[PDB]
Design a protein around this ligand. Structure first.
Ligand SMILES: COc1ccccc1-c1cc(Cl)nc(N)n1
Length: 215
């Protein structure tokens, strides 16, 4: 029996599209900061469910453990960052991952063209897009309480897709899957991941575990 699935294809907001093009087509040193930005987003999402659970403890029915998992896969060249934070509703997803303008986008692009280090991206509220420093495609799977699980994906180029995810269920949280560019495979190495977590993400207030495939 053939299954049918609805897909929605969206255009990035004009300046977000401009920023993504600048990140992808310009050389930057210090690309390693992409992981800091993603872990920071996870930490923020974990704070959110933690505080929400104080007013409504049943919001943890979907999983009580608050943590971050890092999963490098050298076979398909993906680095996956998974958290059990609050997750995103459909509205959160579309508004936070490309359709709604961000007030910091223009300032940051001016800063970059002026020679600013790419590390400054977090300050401007668009840190997620640093993923495209190392990834040619990014897939985001997310599950918020009382909503369905959604899959967001983009290879840049001006568009992204959103669909209801019929794949493996997450209890609650967000999974960011980085399909790495061929020259950025160092971020699949255990030593390198430990290095940049130690350097940039040492004060995160939730457990982080690195899972390393044998061999
Ligand atoms: C505001 O949070 C985000 C902004 C941009 C991209 C992703 C996120 C996000 C949201 C949630 Cl609930 N979790 C995670 N890990 N990232």
């Amino acid at each position: 029996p053939m299954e049918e699935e609805e897909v929605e294809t969206f255009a990035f907001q004009a300046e977000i599209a401009q920023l993504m093009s600048l990140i992808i087509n310009t050389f930057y040193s210090n690309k390693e900061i992409f992981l800091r930005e993603l872990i920071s987003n996870s930490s923020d999402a974990l704070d959110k469910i933690r505080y929400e659970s104080l007013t409504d403890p049943s919001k943890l029915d979907s999983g009580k453990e608050l943590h971050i998992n890092l999963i490098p896969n050298k076979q398909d060249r993906t680095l996956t960052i998974v958290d059990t934070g609050i997750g995103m509703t459909k509205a959160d997803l579309i508004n936070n991952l490309g359709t709604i303008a961000k007030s910091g986008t223009k300032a940051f692009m001016e800063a970059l063209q002026a020679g600013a280090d790419i590390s400054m991206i977090g300050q401007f509220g668009v840190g997620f897009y640093s993923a495209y420093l190392v990834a040619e495609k990014v897939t985001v799977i997310t599950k918020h309480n009382d909503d369905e699980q959604y899959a967001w994906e983009s290879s840049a180029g001006g568009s992204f897709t959103v669909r209801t995810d019929t794949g493996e269920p997450m209890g609650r949280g967000t999974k960011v899957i980085l399909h790495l560019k061929e020259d950025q495979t160092e971020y699949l190495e255990e030593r390198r991941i430990k290095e940049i977590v130690k350097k940039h993400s040492q004060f995160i207030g939730y457990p982080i575990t690195l899972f390393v495939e044998k061999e």
